[PDB]
Amino acid sequence: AKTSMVAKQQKKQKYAVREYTRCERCGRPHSVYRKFKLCRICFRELAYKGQIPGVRKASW
Amino acid sequence: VEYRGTGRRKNSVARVRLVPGEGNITVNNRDVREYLPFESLILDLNQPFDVTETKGNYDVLVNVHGGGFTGQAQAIRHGIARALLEADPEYRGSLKRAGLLTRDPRMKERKKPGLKAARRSPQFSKR
Amino acid sequence: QKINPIGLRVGIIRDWEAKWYAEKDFASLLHEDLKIRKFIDNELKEASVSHVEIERAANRINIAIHTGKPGMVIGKGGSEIEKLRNKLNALTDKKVHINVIEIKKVDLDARLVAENIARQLENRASFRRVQKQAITRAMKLGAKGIKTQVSGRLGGADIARAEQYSEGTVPLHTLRADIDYAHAEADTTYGKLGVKVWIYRG
Amino acid sequence: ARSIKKGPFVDEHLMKKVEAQEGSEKKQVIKTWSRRSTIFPNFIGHTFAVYDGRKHVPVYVTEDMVGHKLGEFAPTRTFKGH
Amino acid sequence: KIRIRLKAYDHRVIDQSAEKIVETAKRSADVSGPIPLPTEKSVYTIIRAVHKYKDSREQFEQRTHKRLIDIVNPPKTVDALMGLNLPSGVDIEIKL
Amino acid sequence: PRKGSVPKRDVLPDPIHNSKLVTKLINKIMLDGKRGTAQRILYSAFDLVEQRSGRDALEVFEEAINNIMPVLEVKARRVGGSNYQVPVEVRPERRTTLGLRWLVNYARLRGEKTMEDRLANEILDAANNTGGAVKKREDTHKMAEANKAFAHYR
Amino acid sequence: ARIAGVDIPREKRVVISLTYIYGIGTSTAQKILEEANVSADTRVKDLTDDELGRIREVVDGYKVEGDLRRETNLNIKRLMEISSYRGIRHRRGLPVRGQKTKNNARTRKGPVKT
RNA sequence: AAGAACCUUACCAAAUCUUGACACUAGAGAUAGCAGGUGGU
RNA sequence: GUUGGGCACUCUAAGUUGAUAAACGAGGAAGGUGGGGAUGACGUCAAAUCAUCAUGCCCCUAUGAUUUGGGCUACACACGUGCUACAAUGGACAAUACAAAGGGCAGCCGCGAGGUGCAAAUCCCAAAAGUUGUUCUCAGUUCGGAUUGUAGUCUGCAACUCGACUACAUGAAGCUGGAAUCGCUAGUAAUCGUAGAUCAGCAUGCUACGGUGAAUACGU
Ligand SMILES: [Mg+2]
Ligand SMILES: [Mg+2]
Ligand SMILES: [Mg+2]
Ligand SMILES: [Mg+2]
Ligand SMILES: [Mg+2]
Ligand SMILES: [Mg+2]
Ligand SMILES: [Zn+2]
């Protein structure tokens, strides 16, 4: 994301509805999980390192 | 003086008690005919008394849960055959030949990513 | 095409590097963890750090640092680890306790071998020679197998390619095999070079 | 539609412009960006140069427009063709 | 009656901690054995690729294992179990 | 399939007429897994048959099926620039399949309002050697005997 | 027979037959036959003269047929006369409720013109 | 794109800023009394 | 089962088992890698991604930054993927059964949308198809609910462009679809509901869950 875009999302908005989420690692605005605050891409990379506790590849 | 058997079919579990009697079946304190929708289901679950030649010899008290009426009716059949093994282990030969001692291992298949269902693929167009 | 060897084995035969539990502060603790891991990577980039483990309990953070050169992390008289612990307590406002664990045989550690190759590539060393030397060293130290790969503009070529070498067995489909894996990047005048190392100890 | 319990929404800055001209005869055009303001009964007789995205277009308010949004009379898309 | 609840992401560390609480209570006084509560499984389905190819996904899970321990007729026990420190991945709720 | 033949699934006899053929008929009637509707149609149709004919419904139904089941069929074949409809003998299990399929398919095309009415009239018709399903069998034999010279192909 | 100026079908039950009046749907027909105490299952050819009179008096209290058509047409005319966004869509023959017109606007537009 | 009314948002118009967003009154508000770039390959 | 009482049965979840010179009936829950998943070799497409991120070179310090409003939702058309239908194996009305998997902290009187105990095996979100009856009677209709008018509810600073839902009214095309073309081998296809992520509000999409539940495979 653009640096101004990341900065603007971190500022307090004039209205509560203007608040939106970005990935806290890379700033991506799309596909951001609430539990981890990571986009789907960063979640995959960090889960591969074993750095997200309890998270592993699922099969059933 | 009763015999117990646990029957499973799909996601249904039946706890089956056999007491001597005239051939009544009660399912969750209801008559089997007021509990199941079809008579073909009733004939399916009375199979163990057929191959064993014990119709009208026991009463069935059933505590069943999970699944639908077909899975429950067939979990009761599995439970009755298992309970009949307790009454007389010599029933095993006739029950096994009829396939009534098998736990039907067929369960709902999981959906797969990319598919519309377990196996159903999306409509394809080479264009 | 080929799955990350670590990610496939995480939670199966490989343990998590983050050992803590949370429910509603999960995101806040996860990003304090990532804040710490980025700080340690930058502050100890010359100290041959293989990996960092983080344990949390009772407003305390226990950080284990597995390092090839533990005397640089601790410092002469414990002074370098006291300085790093003081800076971690400022990034965190929690009570951090740091443990240092020496890893003997740095030539059997995928991360250290990968970063050594990346450092040599930045010094214009032969992308073939660095891979072959690393493989010979690991196998002499009893490695069951090793695989190396350098990808990119090798030697400043205009067309990027991948050159890989191997020795021994590296059974990437065997789930119970503990395969050490790492990727590192060399910053050359021609752009990024990717270094991947697979090591199978046994 | 907006909940009746919340009343009809008008931007406060625009409403003060209308009330400032209340009790006059030489009404002057009110320039506004508030397409989302409901037209109130006291808007009748007034002209509103309403922003359509690139220019303020005049919207003269008659009684039959009361209760509509100001934006409903300043079209934002241009189409005359295929 | 002391009600102790254990939650962990790994079942091996939760059986180790559950046994330790059970021994500690019985080394002090009557404990109802570790009751295994149902595991919570949360699944995350992400797109594997970074830009397209929606039909290729990767699935991840987080499993929360749960244990319940009841201690009856304790007052050394309440301090004995309180003094215990469990592994880092286990969180314990003592409803003493 | 290429590997070989696959085992077939048995069915239970129906509770009323103790007939496996009747159960297979209900499955042909059934749509979208709705078995209760299919059973209701079949048993209502058999009541209509038993009183519009004066006989047992099952006995009429076996007569009707015997008049629909074909003995010879035609198979497509590519023979060096000329497609040849080779006549073959229908195996006993396929005879029952076609008998039940044609009975239901041509009962669905009739003009009676309810399916129980349509099925009962198809059964009564096929038991008198008439109706759409009997005609379809006749046209299959008429296509086969017109090609009995081609029996030498395989 | 003739209720609001329209000859409702004679062979049907009253609840259904009343819906052949412009302005009366299923729910209105039910309430009209509750107000005017007529059973819903009566065929309108079997309605007594008294029952038919009670229906016509309750129906008289509803805006139906040409009075309802005039009101609806006046509303559309007002939207077009003030040149609102909806009034413009009404005159152009396009959907007025924010539906997409790139595809699937055939009801308002008519058959395709390839 | 696993969530376009504002925000997102990049695109357009207008009103504004030039070590820069980041390292009670007036006004539609924003506002007054070396970095950056979702620019190209 | 709302509790006194018990851990019998069920269940929950840790451990432990769980049956082919090669190969080609008994016993057993299961017979031949049992069903499914994860796992995708050397390489090909200079295949996709400089817009997740990073980065060599080209490229200005206005292609950088802020806000309000508009647009991304346009509309003669063409194509792909879906949803709802064309009805009697059905529509409407009434009564009455049977799931699984998940989520939850400031979160889980009005005809109506709606308004005014539980941090979890505890409380909440929360089955339909089905079965039994009554009615409709083959009609573009008691099928269909597109479109449009009016009046509302809720979220949100704000539903004009451009939200969702509700009530009354309106009642379009559509009566099984040319050439051609797609999926599926069994708890599958078909069909019926349920849950989750994203998310103030917005799902006919995606991912996941169970209920009912087939036909056929002679052969290459
Ligand atoms: Mg938002
Ligand atoms: Mg916008
Ligand atoms: Mg290319
Ligand atoms: Mg760039
Ligand atoms: Mg778009
Ligand atoms: Mg209807
Ligand atoms: Zn990210």
Side-chain angles (χ1 to χ4, degrees), chain A, chain B residues 2-33 35-38 40-42 45-52 54-96 98-126, chain C residues 1-18 20-37 39-40 47-52 54 56-59 61-68 70-71 73-75 77-79 81 84-85 88-94 96-101 103 105-118 120-121 123 125-128 130-132 134-139 141-162 164-202, chain D residues 1-4 6-11 13-15 17-18 20-21 23-24 27 29-62 65-79 81, chain E residues 2-25 28-29 31-75 77-78 80 83-84 86-91, chain F residues 1-77 79-154, chain G residues 1 3-6 8-9 12-47 52-53 55-56 59-66 68-70 72-80 82-90 92-114:
Chain A
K2 282 199 307 213
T3 289
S4 64
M5 292 307 288
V6 163
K8 197 190 289 143
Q9 184 263 340
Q10 268 136 48
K11 260 166 37 83
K12 192 200 178 267
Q13 323 278 2
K14 202 165 197 234
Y15 308 117
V17 277
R18 300 220 163 138
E19 304 282 7
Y20 64 102
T21 63
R22 293 180 173 282
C23 171
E24 301 302 309
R25 195 165 175 247
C26 72
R28 204 186 198 255
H30 264 310
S31 295
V32 187
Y33 279 120
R34 278 166 172 200
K35 178 158 178 71
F36 314 103
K37 281 206 226 283
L38 300 168
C39 72
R40 61 170 173 90
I41 295 162
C42 290
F43 175 82
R44 191 181 179 228
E45 316 182 322
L46 294 173
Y48 274 6
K49 289 176 192 158
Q51 289 177 16
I52 311 187
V55 170
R56 62 178 199 168
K57 283 178 60 84
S59 54
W60 68 91
Chain B
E2 64 194 32
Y3 312 99
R4 270 146 217 121
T6 293
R8 293 199 196 79
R9 176 77 160 93
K10 285 166 164 211
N11 283 264
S12 293
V13 176
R15 287 172 263 181
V16 171
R17 299 146 60 209
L18 290 182
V19 283
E22 60 219 13
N24 317 105
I25 298 148
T26 305
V27 182
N28 303 358
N29 314 139
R30 294 156 61 182
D31 181 58
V32 62
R33 286 139 198 306
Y35 190 90
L36 299 178
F38 319 137
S40 76
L41 288 172
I42 259 81
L45 70 88
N46 272 275
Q47 281 181 269
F49 299 129
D50 292 337
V51 310
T52 278
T54 43
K55 288 223 64 43
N57 264 252
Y58 296 98
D59 259 23
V60 191
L61 285 319
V62 181
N63 185 2
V64 76
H65 87 272
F69 50 81
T70 285
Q72 290 189 346
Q74 265 149 77
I76 296 166
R77 170 185 52 105
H78 193 215
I80 282 168
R82 279 197 163 166
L84 279 172
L85 291 180
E86 299 213 329
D88 197 353
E90 280 323 290
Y91 291 155
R92 173 169 265 278
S94 129
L95 286 168
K96 181 146 116 82
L100 305 166
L101 294 183
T102 297
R103 205 285 210 203
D104 212 289
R106 289 179 298 156
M107 320 273 306
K108 209 104 194 210
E109 177 155 337
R110 70 158 287 190
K111 190 191 169 294
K112 321 275 158 50
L115 304 186
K116 304 267 183 170
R119 309 228 174 154
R120 217 271 181 230
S121 298
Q123 183 147 110
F124 163 99
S125 139
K126 74 157 82 153
Chain C
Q1 226 183 263
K2 272 148 285 295
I3 193 166
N4 196 293
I6 298 310
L8 178 67
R9 272 152 267 250
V10 156
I12 304 292
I13 57 146
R14 212 169 181 88
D15 180 35
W16 282 277
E17 297 202 329
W20 43 265
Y21 183 84
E23 313 187 290
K24 85 174 37 173
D25 40 328
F26 199 102
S28 94
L29 299 177
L30 178 62
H31 282 94
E32 183 141 83
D33 265 43
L34 304 165
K35 205 159 73 123
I36 282 147
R37 309 188 111 111
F39 182 88
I40 288 164
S48 271
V49 171
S50 188
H51 59 287
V52 172
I54 306 190
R56 278 161 189 279
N59 55 75
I61 301 183
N62 298 295
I63 292 161
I65 303 188
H66 302 59
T67 166
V73 182
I74 298 194
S79 44
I81 195 185
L84 164 81
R85 196 191 44 83
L88 282 182
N89 285 181
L91 248 58
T92 312
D93 318 277
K94 317 186 107 291
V96 170
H97 174 48
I98 302 183
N99 332 110
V100 181
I101 300 140
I103 65 200
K105 330 158 55 83
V106 310
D107 286 321
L108 291 184
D109 188 84
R111 157 88 29 216
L112 295 188
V113 171
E115 298 269 14
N116 181 42
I117 290 169
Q120 289 177 85
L121 285 173
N123 291 332
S126 164
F127 62 88
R128 301 197 179 78
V130 296
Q131 302 192 61
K132 313 230 276 301
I135 281 176
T136 295
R137 256 176 311 235
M139 297 305 285
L141 297 160
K144 225 47 55 183
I146 170 148
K147 178 160 68 158
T148 302
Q149 193 177 257
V150 178
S151 290
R153 295 169 68 175
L154 315 183
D158 204 275
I159 281 136
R161 58 172 160 117
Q164 66 138 86
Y165 303 88
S166 176
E167 204 178 282
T169 161
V170 188
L172 290 176
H173 275 67
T174 292
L175 287 170
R176 43 161 218 271
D178 44 17
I179 290 162
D180 201 21
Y181 169 80
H183 167 250
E185 282 179 311
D187 298 324
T188 76
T189 71
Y190 302 111
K192 274 318 163 103
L193 288 179
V195 177
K196 290 182 180 171
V197 174
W198 300 255
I199 307 195
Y200 178 40
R201 298 267 255 125
Chain D
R2 191 171 161 90
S3 280
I4 305 276
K6 281 142 82 63
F9 177 79
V10 59
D11 273 309
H13 47 80
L14 166 72
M15 188 47 109
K17 284 148 192 292
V18 175
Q21 309 205 15
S24 313
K27 306 226 164 304
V29 166
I30 298 176
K31 156 140 66 57
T32 169
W33 285 255
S34 202
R35 306 172 53 80
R36 74 203 190 162
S37 289
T38 304
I39 298 161
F40 272 62
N42 72 338
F43 288 24
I44 290 158
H46 279 104
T47 316
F48 299 87
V50 181
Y51 204 63
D52 76 332
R54 44 153 168 211
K55 74 204 173 279
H56 300 268
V57 306
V59 176
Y60 178 73
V61 171
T62 45
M65 301 154 72
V66 169
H68 285 100
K69 297 302 181 98
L70 264 185
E72 307 187 34
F73 310 94
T76 65
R77 292 196 196 79
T78 278
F79 178 77
Chain E
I2 324 198
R3 182 145 286 178
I4 305 198
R5 284 165 58 91
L6 304 186
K7 292 197 234 96
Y9 296 131
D10 157 46
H11 85 259
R12 287 147 16 238
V13 85
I14 217 196
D15 297 288
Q16 270 183 3
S17 296
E19 292 336 297
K20 177 174 315 272
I21 293 164
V22 158
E23 256 80 353
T24 296
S28 58
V31 46
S32 147
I35 297 121
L37 302 174
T39 309
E40 322 152 14
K41 161 158 173 261
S42 68
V43 176
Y44 311 91
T45 298
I46 59 150
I47 295 159
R48 218 180 268 249
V50 307
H51 172 239
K52 60 188 201 134
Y53 314 115
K54 175 67 154 306
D55 291 344
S56 181
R57 319 278 187 100
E58 194 170 20
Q59 266 156 346
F60 292 86
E61 64 188 334
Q62 195 185 60
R63 290 191 204 189
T64 294
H65 303 266
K66 278 135 101 181
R67 296 302 177 268
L68 180 67
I69 294 120
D70 255 5
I71 317 187
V72 265
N73 314 144
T77 301
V78 48
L84 243 189
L86 287 184
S88 211
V90 183
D91 91 317
Chain F
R2 302 190 165 282
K3 282 309 209 105
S5 309
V6 153
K8 321 242 194 78
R9 307 195 186 72
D10 210 35
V11 300
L12 287 179
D14 76 290
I16 306 213
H17 303 285
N18 198 224
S19 168
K20 269 153 132 176
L21 178 62
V22 163
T23 297
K24 272 140 128 190
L25 179 52
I26 289 149
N27 283 339
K28 306 292 192 99
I29 295 175
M30 166 180 66
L31 315 149
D32 305 329
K34 297 183 121 178
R35 161 164 282 133
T37 315
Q39 274 167 21
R40 177 168 324 115
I41 291 156
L42 190 270
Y43 289 125
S44 275
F46 271 28
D47 293 0
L48 290 176
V49 167
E50 170 127 38
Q51 73 201 12
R52 284 168 190 166
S53 77
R55 311 209 262 128
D56 206 59
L58 196 281
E59 196 181 327
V60 179
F61 166 66
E62 285 168 325
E63 255 150 10
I65 273 295
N66 286 342
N67 290 341
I68 302 166
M69 279 177 346
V71 331
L72 286 162
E73 252 206 322
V74 120
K75 231 165 73 192
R77 167 84 142 88
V79 203
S82 198
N83 57 316
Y84 281 162
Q85 300 273 33
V86 195
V88 317
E89 283 254 335
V90 192
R91 21 168 184 130
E93 296 80 26
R94 185 165 154 80
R95 301 190 65 228
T96 283
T97 284
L98 296 180
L100 298 180
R101 165 145 86 239
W102 293 347
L103 173 77
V104 172
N105 275 357
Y106 285 102
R108 270 164 187 169
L109 310 165
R110 296 182 63 114
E112 284 93 11
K113 291 293 101 209
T114 69
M115 187 71 178
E116 61 246 42
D117 223 292
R118 279 178 242 120
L119 185 61
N121 285 156
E122 250 296 304
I123 293 176
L124 289 156
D125 268 7
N128 294 328
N129 262 293
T130 60
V134 166
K135 182 190 193 281
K136 161 85 178 149
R137 183 260 294 151
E138 278 156 12
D139 283 9
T140 306
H141 289 171
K142 262 174 198 86
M143 196 184 269
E145 57 201 57
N147 290 60
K148 90 143 62 65
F150 292 170
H152 65 110
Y153 290 105
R154 280 304 94 159
Chain G
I3 287 201
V6 2
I8 62 170
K12 291 153 151 38
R13 297 161 55 234
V14 244
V15 256
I16 316 297
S17 290
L18 280 179
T19 57
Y20 280 72
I21 295 161
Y22 186 89
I24 299 171
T26 296
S27 92
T28 309
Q30 277 163 218
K31 281 158 28 53
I32 291 174
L33 295 181
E34 289 143 14
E35 235 181 297
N37 229 57
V38 172
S39 162
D41 300 311
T42 311
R43 309 292 169 142
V44 341
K45 77 181 139 72
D46 297 316
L47 287 173
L52 195 61
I55 285 167
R56 295 200 247 242
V59 161
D60 212 278
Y62 289 77
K63 194 195 272 286
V64 307
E65 277 302 303
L68 189 63
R69 285 191 176 93
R70 268 186 306 273
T72 303
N73 293 328
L74 280 200
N75 293 333
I76 290 154
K77 183 200 199 284
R78 190 194 49 95
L79 291 176
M80 296 199 289
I82 65 165
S83 176
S84 55
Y85 175 84
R86 278 203 286 143
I88 285 151
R89 310 297 281 182
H90 269 292
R92 245 172 250 190
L94 286 180
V96 316
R97 297 174 178 204
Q99 300 105 316
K100 270 153 202 97
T101 58
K102 209 200 176 144
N103 303 295
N104 312 138
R106 290 345 292 197
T107 296
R108 291 284 304 173
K109 264 158 93 181
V112 305
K113 280 132 15 141
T114 315

